């Protein structure tokens, strides 16, 4: 039987998880709908999302949230992934000033067994892109370029992205702390 139950609602995040931790015998998958908490700070959102998920499913649950922090906008989006994506799909390459062009991509996991919470945070930065390039990704992967690369997230393969993305190093750290 599974012990920890990963909760997600985005189907593309689910495919990238099961590419890595799909062979783990003790990780189940749930798709319970929870009300998304809106705030700029990632540490605050992921810590409050785990309570809203545990109230929905009441099993030991793992949640996840992503963030993009642009240095030419002083944070912004941050952990407000929902209201910018509903209006500015990939137009952030244009509403940014063309001068500074530097941002940070952040991800966070949180696993709550009903008593305690534990937050894992990983961070990656290179720059932002002038034009949306690439197809395979989710929410801002066509317009993000890490350091030392000319190729975006969505222009890379699935094994190339997880060597660079924040969510690729979180899933490795999630294995060695819960067994899995």
């Amino acid at each position: 039987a599974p012990t920890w139950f990963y909760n997600t609602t985005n189907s593309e995040k689910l495919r990238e998880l099961q590419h890595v931790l799909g062979g783990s015998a003790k990780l189940g998958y749930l798709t319970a709908k929870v009300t998304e908490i809106l705030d700029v700070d990632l540490e605050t959102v992921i810590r409050a999302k785990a309570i809203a998920a545990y109230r929905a499913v009441r099993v030991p649950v793992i949640v996840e949230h992503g963030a993009l922090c642009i240095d030419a906008l002083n944070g912004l989006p941050g952990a407000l992934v929902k209201p910018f994506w509903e209006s500015l799909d990939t137009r952030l390459c244009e509403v940014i000033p063309a001068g500074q062009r530097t941002a940070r991509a952040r991800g966070a996991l949180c696993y709550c067994d009903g008593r305690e919470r534990h937050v894992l945070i990983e961070e990656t930065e290179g720059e932002i892109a002038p034009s949306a390039r690439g197809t395979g990704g989710f929410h801002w992967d066509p317009i993000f370029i890490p350091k030392g690369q000319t190729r975006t997230f969505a222009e890379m393969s699935l094994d190339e992205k997880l060597s660079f993305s924040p969510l690729g190093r979180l899933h490795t750290r999630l294995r060695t702390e819960l067994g899995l």
């Binding site: 039987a1 599974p2 189940g28 499913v57 009441r58 099993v59 067994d113 009903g114």
Partner: protein
């Protein structure tokens, strides 16, 4: 302090082989039938009173809004019961019940007594899809009427939609049933002397089923008052989320919690009923 599927199955076999297991089925047992859930039942009839549906919901719980709807007009609560009898007992819910794996796994076992708290006819109709006979027991005229001996007695603890004077839907009718003086309550007082109960399809925040769980334990300890204290049978509650506080409370109410797999909720209850066989 929580059973799995595999270590609750030999404990539910033993109560079933000696004929002492009674299912007590809630509203989550009727979830695969895609029925309305009160968020659009009386919120739809709120436009007759003159409200907006998001604003009628603001003024209280569903049992309280139904009490307001009953005291509004003469012969007004019967508008809701006739609307529930067309939505819950509809031909689309009949066809989902014939393909439902829980309603097939329930009906494949020779039960003597089934309690249910929901008003639809899908526990009796499940037994009749398997070719078995069921007797619906809601009112005094149903208990008095003739039956056979082998027939499973389906006890409608909160009433039937085709007998609208038996429905427990107003808050005052929930408060009236806490005295345990109704005919399904008098039958429950005698069944708790001899039987184990399997509760399926409830939440921990229901607060009506928590009172019944308290009050069954109190009547079971009042039963063995003058005699020495003997170890009674154990009741069961199958859940898809148990948590970390509520299983320890129900232990003092003679209830063991069975943790089922939450990935497919209808399949896991079907595997529980198929392991009783």
């Amino acid at each position: 302090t929580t059973l799995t599927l595999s270590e609750a199955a030999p404990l539910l076999k033993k109560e079933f082989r000696e004929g002492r297991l009674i299912p007590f089925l809630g509203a989550g047992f009727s979830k695969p039938l895609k029925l309305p859930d009160g968020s659009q039942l009386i919120a739809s009839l709120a436009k007759t009173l003159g409200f907006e549906p998001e604003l009628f919901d603001m003024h209280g719980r569903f049992e309280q809004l139904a009490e307001f709807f009953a005291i509004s007009a003469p012969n007004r609560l019967q508008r809701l019961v006739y609307e529930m009898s067309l939505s819950f007992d509809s031909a689309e819910a009949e066809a989902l019940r014939e393909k439902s794996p829980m309603h097939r796994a329930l009906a494949a076992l020779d039960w003597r007594t089934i309690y249910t708290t929901n008003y639809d006819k899908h526990v009796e109709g499940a037994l009749r899809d398997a070719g078995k006979q069921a007797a619906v027991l809601a009112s005094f005229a149903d208990f008095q009427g003739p039956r056979a001996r082998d027939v499973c007695e389906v006890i409608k603890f909160h009433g039937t939609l085709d007998q609208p004077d038996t429905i427990v839907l107003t808050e005052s009718s929930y408060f009236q049933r806490m005295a345990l003086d109704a005919p399904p309550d008098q039958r429950l007082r005698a069944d708790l002397l001899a039987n184990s109960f399997l509760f399926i399809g409830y939440s921990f925040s229901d607060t009506n089923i928590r009172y019944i769980w308290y009050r069954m334990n109190q009547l079971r300890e009042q039963s063995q008052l003058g005699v020495k204290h003997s170890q009674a049978r154990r009741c069961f509650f199958a859940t898809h989320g148990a948590g970390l506080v509520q299983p320890d409370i129900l232990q003092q109410w003679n209830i063991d919690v069975i943790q089922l797999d939450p990935t497919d909720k209808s399949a896991s209850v079907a595997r529980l009923l198929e392991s009783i066989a």
